[PDB]
Ligand SMILES: CC1=C/CC[C@@H](C)CC[C@H](C(C)C)\C=C\1
Ligand SMILES: [Mg+2]
Ligand SMILES: [Mg+2]
């Protein structure tokens with residue numbers, strides 16, 4: 001059981017609001033028309049709210065609900081990208097992204113805009129009530145880079161071209177939208193980091209390490225369903241192509257890279273410089289937030305129907 005090798009020298013927590021938030025995320029999905037024909041009794045088992053509850057365990061219920069609805073949005077968008085025709089059609093993906101980008105700039109959806117565009121506009125509206133412009137611009141840019149990454153995946157599928165390890169790992173940091181999920185830690189923890197701390201090389205490196213761990217963990221758990229769809233956006237499949245090795249060996253190599261990235265994250269935690277008492281207090285809440293996300297991703301994914 002190679003899954004038992006997905007271990008961390010720390011553990012997570014879950015918000016006491018978990019089930020309330022999950023029920024509300026389903027009601028939200030139904031309200032905005034995101035639940036497709038194939039899903040009726042499968043809808044109950046999505047449990048997207050129970051991932052959010054683990055990722056932001058200390059958040060107030062209102063802020064947690066924005067995070068849960070956002071996480072659900074990302075799953076709904078992802079299944080369109082990864083399991084339908086739109087992920088093989090760059091021109092259809094560009095037309096959709098043009099609508100999302102107009103909504104991220106604060107435009108109102110038109111009558112004939114799709115459910116995902118309306119739902120994205122709802123999340124932006126609710127975030128604008130809770131966050132300053134500075135934060136909203138950083139979130140929006142992280143979301144734009146997720147769309148760019150999805151268009152990158154679409155070109156790979158159209159060309160039938162598996163990326164090399166260096167290209168894949170560099171792009172995978174954007175294709176999972178993990179940086180946009182990290183932005184929400186600030187709102188969950190109600191912390192205001194000054195510019196020089198927010199963008200410090202050690203903070204960027206801790207964010208990169210946490211993002212890598214989360215994505216490579218997902219890759220080990222999601223290679224089966226991704227292979228079932230003839231997809232190629234997975235460290236296991238990418239390693240297999242580069243090394244011309246067996247699937248068991250590629251899995252072994254992916255888990256080695258995961259273990260190494262956990263150690264890098266633990267090491268770099270002890271390298272955060274002393275700015276001042278108030279800045280380092282806030283900074284340690286953010287970095288603790290990254291740990292909660294690492295654990296949430298693993299803890300939710302091992303039990304989720306999504307990877308069963
Ligand atoms: C692999 C991912 C890890 C981060 C988990 C979380 C952000 C889920 C939503 C988002 C889309 C792609 C589901 C992310 C993917
Ligand atoms: Mg995807
Ligand atoms: Mg996917």
Ligand SMILES: [Mg+2]
Nearest residue numbers: 218219222226
């Ligand atoms: Mg995956």
